[PDB]
C-alpha cells in the first residue's frame, strides 16, 4: 500500500509517501526521513488512512 507522512518541524513542514508491505516498514523509513531533516518528536499513526504524523 501507499503510506503518507506529515512532518511538522515548526516553520518547516513536509508531506512524503513511501510504498511498503506493511505499516511497520513504512514507519522505519519515515523515521529516518524525519531525523535526516532534524525532526525528532511526537509520532502518530492512523491505520484508516495509512497516515503517520511526526511533530517536533
Residue numbers in the entry: 1 to 56
Verbatim from the authors:
Encouraged by this result, we next incorporated serine with moderate helix propensity, valine and threonine with low helix propensity at the i + 2 site of the type-II′ β-turn. With the decreasing helix propensity of amino acids in the order Ala > Ser > Val, we noted an increase in both d and θ between COi+1 → COi+2, suggesting a gradual weakening of the n → π* interaction at the i + 2 residue. Thus, to obtain a quantitative estimate of the n → π* interaction energy (En→π*) at the i + 2 residue in 2, 3, and 4, we resorted to NBO analysis, which clearly indicated a decreasing En→π* in the order 2 > 3 > 4. The Ramachandran plot of the i + 2 residue in the type-II′ β-turn of 2, 3, 4, and 5 revealed that, as the strength of the n → π* interaction increases, the torsion angles of an amino acid in a non-helical region in the absence of the stabilizing intramolecular hydrogen bond are gradually altered to occupy the right-handed α-helical region. 5 with the strongest COi+1 → COi+2 n → π* interaction displayed the maximum stability (TM) and 4 with no detectable COi+1 → COi+2 n → π* interaction showed the least stability. We were surprised to note a very good correlation between the TM of these proteins and En→π* between COi+1 → COi+2, in the absence of the stabilizing COi⋯HNi+3 hydrogen bond.
